[PDB]
Amino acid sequence: EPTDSGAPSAIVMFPVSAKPNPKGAAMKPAVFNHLAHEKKIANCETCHHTGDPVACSTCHTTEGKAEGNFVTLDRAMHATNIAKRAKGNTPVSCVSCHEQQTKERRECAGCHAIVTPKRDQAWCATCHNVTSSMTPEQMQQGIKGKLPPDQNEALAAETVLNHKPVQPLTAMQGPYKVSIDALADKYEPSNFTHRRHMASLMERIKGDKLAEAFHNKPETLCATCHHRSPLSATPPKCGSCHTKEIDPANPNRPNLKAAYHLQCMGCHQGMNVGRPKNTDCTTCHKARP
Numbered sequence: 001e002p003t004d005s006g007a008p009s010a011i012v013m014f015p016v017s018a019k020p021n022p023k024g025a026a027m028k029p030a031v032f033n034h035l036a037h038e039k040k041i042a043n044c045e046t047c048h049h050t051g052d053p054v055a056c057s058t059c060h061t062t063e064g065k066a067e068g069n070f071v072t073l074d075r076a077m078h079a080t081n082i083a084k085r086a087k088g089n090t091p092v093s094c095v096s097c098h099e100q101q102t103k104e105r106r107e108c109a110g111c112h113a114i115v116t117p118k119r120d121q122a123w124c125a126t127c128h129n130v131t132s133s134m135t136p137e138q139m140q141q142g143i144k145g146k147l148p149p150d151q152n153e154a155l156a157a158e159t160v161l162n163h164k165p166v167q168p169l170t171a172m173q174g175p176y177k178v179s180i181d182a183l184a185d186k187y188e189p190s191n192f193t194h195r196r197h198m199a200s201l202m203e204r205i206k207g208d209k210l211a212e213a214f215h216n217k218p219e220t221l222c223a224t225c226h227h228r229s230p231l232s233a234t235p236p237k238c239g240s241c242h243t244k245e246i247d248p249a250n251p252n253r254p255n256l257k258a259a260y261h262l263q264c265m266g267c268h269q270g271m272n273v274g275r276p277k278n279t280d281c282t283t284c285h286k287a288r289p
């Protein structure tokens with residue numbers, strides 16, 4: 001399948017710099033699947049914000065220059081907080097649109113209302129992924145904008161085709177139900193439908209390639225809720241980090257009650273759950289007669 005646009009189906013993107021880089025001091029080049037993107041975004045100018053479709057690096061070099069308003073390659077590819085242009089087009093970055101996706105799509109917006117992205121090495125590597133078949137020489141030529149289109153296409157194509165998404169933990173790999181009773185007092189324990197929740201959440205995003213590329217560890221989705229602890233099938237209790245009472249030390253951290261409310265309710269509201277509403281108290285935990 002060829003692209004409508006006439007662009008290569010997948011493209012390797014290099015760190016175009018005014019500073020010579022004989023040692024290849026750089027991030028691993030990024031492979032952009034143009035075909036898959038263009039099939040999801042009809043407006044070519046959403047990305048090619050100046051109109052004519054040309055490499056962003058023609059204007060956005062690592063150092064920045066006149067043609068790009070000194071907006072560097074780093075900024076053009078990872079900007080967040082991009083201001084809405086009063087007139088004309090509001091450019092997008094790779095990161096901002098991806099971020100847009102998690103906030104605008106109901107199936108993404110529940111977990112992403114409660115997830116604080118790590119944006120660690122694994123996150124960088126999702127984009128910075130050119131096949132290891134790329135040689136230092138090819139790296140040098142791409143940097144100089146002298147890599148032949150056929151070699152670029154071939155490196156990009158190999159990258160796309162050699163990708164194998166990670167096998168996540170099944171909902172059967174987590175507990176079926178969890179009696180959340182760490183604070184049981186005025187109400188009964190909340191009998192959480194742990195497995196049903198996980199399974200419903202995963203089904204809604206099954207096959208999404210953006211989601212699959214960035215959820216790249218078997219337990220990543222478990223970290224949605226079990227955050228700030230090593231990826232694991234048996235994470236520590238919320239109660240191990242969240243104190244019953246506001247802890248006067250480190251710091252502003254929600255106490256346990258708020259941790260549960262903010263987390264459970266935060267997702268429900270993020271993916272517009274019909275029930276329970278945050279005011280449906282006995283739906284999550286029956287009042288104690």
Ligand code: HEC
Pocket residue numbers: 013014015016025026027028029030062073074077078094095098119120121123124125126127128
């Ligand atoms: C896709 C959404 C990306 C993620 C996440 C990260 N980067 Fe990136 N960045 C990506 C592209 C398309 C490009 C341009 C092509 C290239 O690889 O050069 C870049 C550019 C950079 C650069 C500038 C070039 C360089 O000197 O190698 C750097 C320094 C860079 N990116 C760093 C970086 C880091 C550290 C990231 C994780 C925290 C990261 N990027 C994620 C797109 C994407």
Ligand code: HEC
Pocket residue numbers: 004005006007008011012013032034037038041042043044045046047048053054055056057
């Ligand atoms: C963002 C999700 C994209 C949309 C939608 C479209 N394109 Fe694109 N294209 C974009 C990038 C990030 C790249 C790689 C540029 C790089 O630095 O290598 C491009 C590249 C092209 C090109 C090749 C430019 C060249 O290297 O000189 C062409 C001809 C092109 N794109 C055409 C094109 C058309 C017509 C679009 C709508 C059908 C379109 N693109 C949308 C990403 C984005």
Ligand code: HEC
Pocket residue numbers: 047048049050054055056057058059060067068069071075076077079082083085091092093094
């Ligand atoms: C030169 C003809 C351009 C090409 C090709 C690309 N960009 Fe660009 N970019 C250019 C200018 C002159 C400016 C500033 C315009 C203004 O409204 O200020 C921009 C700025 C951006 C930004 C916004 C940065 C921010 O507001 O902080 C982004 C994210 C951006 N550009 C992205 C981008 C991408 C991804 C490109 C290829 C698909 C690309 N630009 C090409 C000029 C030029």
Ligand code: HEC
Pocket residue numbers: 030031032033036037040041046047077092093094095097098101126127208209210213
């Ligand atoms: C919205 C306007 C986008 C822009 C800007 C960029 N990407 Fe993107 N990304 C977008 C969607 C909707 C998807 C899913 C496409 C589909 O098949 O469903 C993707 C996903 C990716 C992926 C994951 C899969 C793959 O192609 O490897 C990668 C790593 C990716 N996007 C990279 C990427 C880079 C490097 C970008 C700037 C050059 C970039 N994307 C911009 C939507 C948007």
Ligand code: HEC
Pocket residue numbers: 098099101102105107108109111112115116117118119120123201202205208210211214215220221223224225
């Ligand atoms: C809970 C079951 C999730 C759903 C459904 C979706 N995502 Fe997700 N995502 C989740 C977690 C816990 C993480 C890890 C954060 C970090 O520590 O790395 C992520 C991460 C992403 C990312 C990368 C981080 C970022 O750039 O913000 C992307 C781009 C992403 N997720 C996209 C995404 C999309 C498009 C979804 C709907 C189709 C989606 N996610 C659903 C957990 C969950």
Ligand code: HEC
Pocket residue numbers: 180181182183184185186187188189190257260261264265268276277278279280281282283284285
């Ligand atoms: C699910 C989305 C919730 C909604 C809606 C409400 N609560 Fe909640 N609550 C939730 C959890 C998972 C827990 C932990 C239960 C425990 O035993 O560990 C709590 C806890 C409380 C508590 C403390 C425990 C108790 O006294 O038994 C209080 C008093 C409480 N919740 C009050 C409360 C009120 C009044 C709500 C409606 C306005 C309400 N909760 C909604 C989950 C959820």
Ligand code: HEC
Pocket residue numbers: 169170171173174175177178179180181182192194197198219221222223224225226232233234235236237238239
């Ligand atoms: C939010 C939607 C969750 C996701 C996604 C996962 N889990 Fe979970 N889990 C979460 C809560 C609120 C609870 C209660 C914790 C507490 O301290 O009250 C749990 C608990 C567990 C446990 C403990 C079971 C037991 O004590 O009976 C385990 C072992 C567990 N969770 C595993 C687990 C795995 C492996 C996940 C991904 C497949 C996963 N959880 C996701 C809420 C959330």
Ligand code: HEC
Pocket residue numbers: 114116225226227228229236237238239240241242252253254258259260262263264
């Ligand atoms: C220690 C290893 C943690 C465990 C286990 C849990 N959480 Fe946590 N969480 C912890 C920190 C250090 C922080 C504060 C971060 C900061 O910005 O101050 C929190 C924060 C929360 C919050 C607020 C929103 C957030 O940033 O994610 C909530 C809603 C929350 N935590 C909920 C929560 C739940 C329900 C837990 C068990 C499933 C849980 N946390 C465990 C660190 C620790």
Ligand code: HEC
Pocket residue numbers: 110111114180190192193196197200201224225260263264265267268271273274275276283284
């Ligand atoms: C998204 C990441 C969620 C988190 C965190 C929690 N819930 Fe949830 N819940 C979620 C969905 C999307 C729905 C609607 C139905 C669907 O699957 O599409 C619900 C539903 C509930 C309900 C009713 C059905 C049930 O399975 O019991 C309850 C009572 C409920 N949720 C409780 C609950 C609690 C106590 C949570 C934190 C421990 C919690 N949910 C987190 C999405 C997500």
